[PDB]
Scaffold this active site. Sequence first.
Site, PDB file in Angstrom:
ATOM      1  CB  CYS A   9      -0.931   0.029   1.211  1.00  0.00           C
ATOM      2  SG  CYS A   9      -0.047   0.161   2.795  1.00  0.00           S
ATOM      3  CE1 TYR A 155       7.755  -8.573 -11.188  1.00  0.00           C
ATOM      4  CE2 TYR A 155       7.344  -9.013 -13.518  1.00  0.00           C
ATOM      5  CZ  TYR A 155       7.004  -8.375 -12.336  1.00  0.00           C
ATOM      6  OH  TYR A 155       5.914  -7.541 -12.290  1.00  0.00           O
TER       7      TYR A 155
HETATM    8  N1  LIG Z   1       5.405  -1.202 -12.984  1.00  0.00           N
HETATM    9  C1  LIG Z   1       5.626  -2.330 -13.670  1.00  0.00           C
HETATM   10  O1  LIG Z   1       6.425  -2.365 -14.619  1.00  0.00           O
HETATM   11  C2  LIG Z   1       4.843  -3.617 -13.250  1.00  0.00           C
HETATM   12  C3  LIG Z   1       4.442  -4.516 -14.273  1.00  0.00           C
HETATM   13  C4  LIG Z   1       3.729  -5.705 -13.980  1.00  0.00           C
HETATM   14  C5  LIG Z   1       3.394  -6.025 -12.655  1.00  0.00           C
HETATM   15  N2  LIG Z   1       3.781  -5.149 -11.607  1.00  0.00           N
HETATM   16  C6  LIG Z   1       3.388  -5.579 -10.225  1.00  0.00           C
HETATM   17  O2  LIG Z   1       2.499  -4.585  -9.643  1.00  0.00           O
HETATM   18  C7  LIG Z   1       2.658  -4.624  -8.193  1.00  0.00           C
HETATM   19  C8  LIG Z   1       2.986  -3.240  -7.637  1.00  0.00           C
HETATM   20  O3  LIG Z   1       4.047  -2.762  -8.445  1.00  0.00           O
HETATM   21  P1  LIG Z   1       4.487  -1.233  -8.552  1.00  0.00           P
HETATM   22  O4  LIG Z   1       5.068  -1.070  -9.915  1.00  0.00           O
HETATM   23  O5  LIG Z   1       3.297  -0.397  -8.200  1.00  0.00           O
HETATM   24  O6  LIG Z   1       5.638  -1.085  -7.454  1.00  0.00           O
HETATM   25  P2  LIG Z   1       5.849  -0.118  -6.188  1.00  0.00           P
HETATM   26  O7  LIG Z   1       7.278  -0.097  -5.765  1.00  0.00           O
HETATM   27  O8  LIG Z   1       5.217   1.173  -6.496  1.00  0.00           O
HETATM   28  O9  LIG Z   1       4.985  -0.933  -5.104  1.00  0.00           O
HETATM   29  C9  LIG Z   1       5.474  -2.185  -4.631  1.00  0.00           C
HETATM   30  C10 LIG Z   1       5.112  -2.255  -3.193  1.00  0.00           C
HETATM   31  O10 LIG Z   1       5.654  -3.498  -2.687  1.00  0.00           O
HETATM   32  C11 LIG Z   1       6.125  -3.177  -1.351  1.00  0.00           C
HETATM   33  N3  LIG Z   1       7.120  -4.188  -0.899  1.00  0.00           N
HETATM   34  C12 LIG Z   1       8.309  -4.489  -1.492  1.00  0.00           C
HETATM   35  N4  LIG Z   1       8.974  -5.438  -0.822  1.00  0.00           N
HETATM   36  C13 LIG Z   1       8.168  -5.709   0.188  1.00  0.00           C
HETATM   37  C14 LIG Z   1       8.424  -6.657   1.203  1.00  0.00           C
HETATM   38  N5  LIG Z   1       9.551  -7.362   1.188  1.00  0.00           N
HETATM   39  N6  LIG Z   1       7.468  -6.810   2.182  1.00  0.00           N
HETATM   40  C15 LIG Z   1       6.330  -6.068   2.162  1.00  0.00           C
HETATM   41  N7  LIG Z   1       6.094  -5.158   1.186  1.00  0.00           N
HETATM   42  C16 LIG Z   1       6.998  -4.949   0.177  1.00  0.00           C
HETATM   43  C17 LIG Z   1       6.729  -1.769  -1.492  1.00  0.00           C
HETATM   44  O11 LIG Z   1       7.050  -1.072  -0.252  1.00  0.00           O
HETATM   45  C18 LIG Z   1       5.686  -1.102  -2.367  1.00  0.00           C
HETATM   46  O12 LIG Z   1       4.677  -0.399  -1.585  1.00  0.00           O
HETATM   47  C19 LIG Z   1       3.753  -5.685  -7.924  1.00  0.00           C
HETATM   48  O13 LIG Z   1       3.190  -6.976  -7.553  1.00  0.00           O
HETATM   49  C20 LIG Z   1       4.530  -5.741  -9.230  1.00  0.00           C
HETATM   50  O14 LIG Z   1       5.338  -6.891  -9.408  1.00  0.00           O
HETATM   51  C21 LIG Z   1       4.510  -3.933 -11.890  1.00  0.00           C
END
Ligand SMILES: NC(=O)c1ccc[n+]([C@@H]2O[C@H](COP(=O)([O-])OP(=O)(O)OC[C@H]3O[C@@H](n4cnc5c(N)ncnc54)[C@H](O)[C@@H]3O)[C@@H](O)[C@H]2O)c1
Lengths: 240, 236
Positions: A9, A155
């Site tokens: 979050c 990943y």
């Molecule tokens: N942006 C992209 O390119 C992309 C593409 C496909 C999927 N996603 C997926 O979307 C989701 C959110 O991604 P995002 O791009 O918004 O990233 P983000 O960094 O904005 O959010 C990721 C969140 O995960 C939390 N987190 C990381 N490690 C953690 C841990 N060890 N324990 C508890 N919390 C932890 C972070 O603090 C953060 O709030 C993820 O599951 C990611 O793999 C992102």
Amino acid sequence: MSIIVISGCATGIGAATRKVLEAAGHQIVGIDIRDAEVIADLSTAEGRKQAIADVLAKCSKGMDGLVLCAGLGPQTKVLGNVVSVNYFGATELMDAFLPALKKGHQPAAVVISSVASAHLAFDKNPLALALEAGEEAKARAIVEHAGEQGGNLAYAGSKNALTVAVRKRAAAWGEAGVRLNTIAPGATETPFVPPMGRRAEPSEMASVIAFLMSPAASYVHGAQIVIDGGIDAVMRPTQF
Amino acid sequence: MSIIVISGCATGIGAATRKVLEAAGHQIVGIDIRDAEVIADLSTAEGRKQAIADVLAKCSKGMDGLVLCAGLGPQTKVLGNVVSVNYFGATELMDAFLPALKKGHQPAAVVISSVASAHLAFDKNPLALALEAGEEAKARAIVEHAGEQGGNLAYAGSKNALTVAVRKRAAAWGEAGVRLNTIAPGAFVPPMGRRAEPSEMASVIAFLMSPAASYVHGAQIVIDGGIDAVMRPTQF
Ligand SMILES: NC(=O)c1ccc[n+]([C@@H]2O[C@H](COP(=O)([O-])OP(=O)(O)OC[C@H]3O[C@@H](n4cnc5c(N)ncnc54)[C@H](O)[C@@H]3O)[C@@H](O)[C@H]2O)c1
Ligand SMILES: NC(=O)c1ccc[n+]([C@@H]2O[C@H](COP(=O)([O-])OP(=O)(O)OC[C@H]3O[C@@H](n4cnc5c(N)ncnc54)[C@H](O)[C@@H]3O)[C@@H](O)[C@H]2O)c1
């Protein structure tokens, strides 16, 4: 009154989703390493156990929704954490929260996977059996010994296993009366206008999650909603 | 003001979709064999051509949306019609309406396929090559000479080819700035434990036609209460 639990979050999609669901009148119980009602690092078994306990203590009357956004990308320093957070950080939480979800009003859950989930077949996914068997140490070793692009393996591998994990839970969750779906994001603007050729704002992921968490998706269950501006369709027109 | 064209608007999902989109303030130009602004039989090439002209005549300034719900299920008297309506009734219309859609505001289109689209592999689809080449007579002939369960072949095969066709148009429609997605309605007892109301198909279409789906393009949204997940957990 109406509680929605959100992992990851603090930033990105999780943060954008919290904002949207809060505007919809929901009380949010967030889980993250900072800026959350439940402070936790889901990379370790003990950390998730404590996060689970801390969340449930706040949802004694149940919860109306669950959005698992916690995740780590390829090129994460210690690849083992990608597997731990991306898979177990999601699977252990959804499994432990189902009982609370069952007691909610029009309960629904959304798990954030990734389009990467489809870049690998589950039967040819080196992490599949280990993850499915809950063998965390083994799964982490597989990616840390992969070498060349162990990041992509960690990943895509965790995400592919995650999407399958969610789909295999469709029958049980359906029986429990709780919808469970995933979204598969493409390129997101994380540090209207046609989607093709641009990245998405985290809010464009959050708007789909809100839909999946609402009565408008009352018959959507076990599905993986690809949100990538069309890239997946161009790449895999015959695969869906 | 905001025009959305809907084929198969007379009943089922098409009717429920017209209802929800009208509740959102859209002006609907329906296409169907009855109870529609454009009366047409999409089972023939001349019927579609006339239907296309009639619609474009009402959308000279363009259209904001398109929802193709016209369809015939397995066990339709004349099976050739299942292929003609399910495939060509959709493909020829979306192709002819793109220019108009391009002139629209936040233009988007939704094609109703079916989870049946996943019951066959495109490269193993007896109608695939025929439909992609626009060989309607041949496509109809194939299902009419299929004998046993030609109905399932006509249906699954037309729907499978449809989803592929829509996905193969993602690049072009993306370039044109128009979103194009499909929904795949379910078609025993699903995990959610009940049959779907047409309105539950329409609410997803409404979502896909709205800004909430601003980054959703070329996707197939399965709406089946969980059946597909249980049958194909590792396939998506
Ligand atoms: N942006 C992209 O390119 C992309 C593409 C496909 C999927 N996603 C997926 O979307 C989701 C959110 O991604 P995002 O791009 O918004 O990233 P983000 O960094 O904005 O959010 C990721 C969140 O995960 C939390 N987190 C990381 N490690 C953690 C841990 N060890 N324990 C508890 N919390 C932890 C972070 O603090 C953060 O709030 C993820 O599951 C990611 O793999 C992102
Ligand atoms: N809910 C389901 O059972 C289900 C499941 C999977 C796929 N679908 C698909 O959803 C779409 C609509 O489904 P529905 O259940 O609402 O069906 P329906 O019978 O309620 O509506 C189908 C519409 O297609 C129109 N139509 C049929 N032949 C036509 C023709 N030759 N020319 C012009 N219009 C014609 C009908 O008059 C009708 O208004 C179809 O493409 C169908 O294959 C429905």
